[model samples]
Target: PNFNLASLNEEMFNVAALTKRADAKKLAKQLMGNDKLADAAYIWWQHNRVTLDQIDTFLKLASRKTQGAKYNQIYNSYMMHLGLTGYEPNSSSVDKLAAALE
Candidate 1:
């Protein structure tokens, strides 16, 4: 491809091993040092529930900042990655988590 596609910035992060913030504790809740990708995906909704503020802003701003041609381009590029499916947390995903000990 002739075009340049940018990745979510990782350079400024505390856990450099994490490729994306969305994949960090926010969207995936997988500890950078421990959890695997499938485990992250399985609990993705739960993670998102706690990190709504982190991602919601970006989504809102992205939708607002890039309107018209830039909008279509970024939206298409972004949504294509997710196969057009939107993500959010639900009750069922949270019900299965282990109870925490105080």
Candidate 2:
């Protein structure tokens, strides 16, 4: 099949981002019509991680193909805002307390 990255509309990229939060079935449905983004989203979901290079590659190609920078900026900004740049583990440490309940 013939797939063109430049041909996809703005909403498709939005839906692609939704694949991060959407459930499996919902994501599948959202990507039903687009094979390329679906495959990319699936790989990202299955691995539970995405690399800056990978997304950058797509954005670079997309910008060249589509001749637009707006969506590229929008998507990359969203990714960074979504904490794709880093992750923090939510944990707590405990301190020793003097207890005499024994």
Candidate 3:
């Protein structure tokens, strides 16, 4: 909780919201606004395909900052969330995003 994305510096904000994790169309507008991190949380939610209620788990992985941890956490959690078992790790946008995170 202490080391969440929200608690980090503006570079972290720029990292996730503006520069790294988010696509320009989805995130740049939100970051450039007078909106602060909390206000722009929705943009993150939308970009990551997570609801606000799911942010706790989402942040857990988001805070990891690298592909391996992020993939492992999300693979376990999201697969369970989908009630799926024996699913292979497909090279979807998740892979693209994870690589970008590194």
Candidate 4:
């Protein structure tokens, strides 16, 4: 699957737990068909705790294969949603997001 469970951020979702596999599956399901930017950012953020590597590895790849644009719409929405949620963009993830957009 494009949503590689092994590549998940262990600290973000606790993959060691039994229910986490279900959580991963559910996330994959949600991401596979999600075309809405809000839903993508909202779910992928995991309440703003999602890491950049996760985005580059799974979220971005999933979007690349699924979305209709080459601009990496997921990163754009992630940045937009982060800004809207009062998340400061310069600390870390924002730079990566910007780079991925290019």
Identify the runs in model 1 with alpha carbons over 4 angstroms from their true place. Answer: 1-9, 12-56, 62-73, 86-102
Clashing pairs in 3: none
In order of appearance, the predictions have TM-scores of 0.21, 0.27, 0.21, 0.34
lDDT of 2 at 48: 45
Candidate 4 CA-lDDT value: 0.44
Query: Model-by-model lDDT, in order?
Result: 0.35, 0.42, 0.41, 0.44
Of the two candidates 2 and 3, the one with more favorable TM-score, higher being better, is 2
In model 3, how large is the Cα lDDT of residue 9? 37
lDDT of 4 by residue, 5-49 (tens): 534443442322314334555554455455563353445355547
lDDT of each residue in 51-78, candidate 1, tens digit only: 3344333333333332222222323333
- For model 2, the local distance difference test gives 0.42
* Ranking 1 against 4 by TM-score, winner: 4
**Per-residue lDDT tens digits of candidate 3, residues 7-56?**
43344333333333334323333333333543444343444564433443
Candidate 4: residue 76 Cα off by (Å): 2.0
Candidate order by TM-score, decreasing, is: 4, 2, 1, 3
lDDT winner between candidates 1 and 3: 3
Model 3, which residues run further than 4 Å from truth?
1-17, 21-70, 84-102
Cα displacement (angstroms), candidate 3, residue 73, comes to 2.0
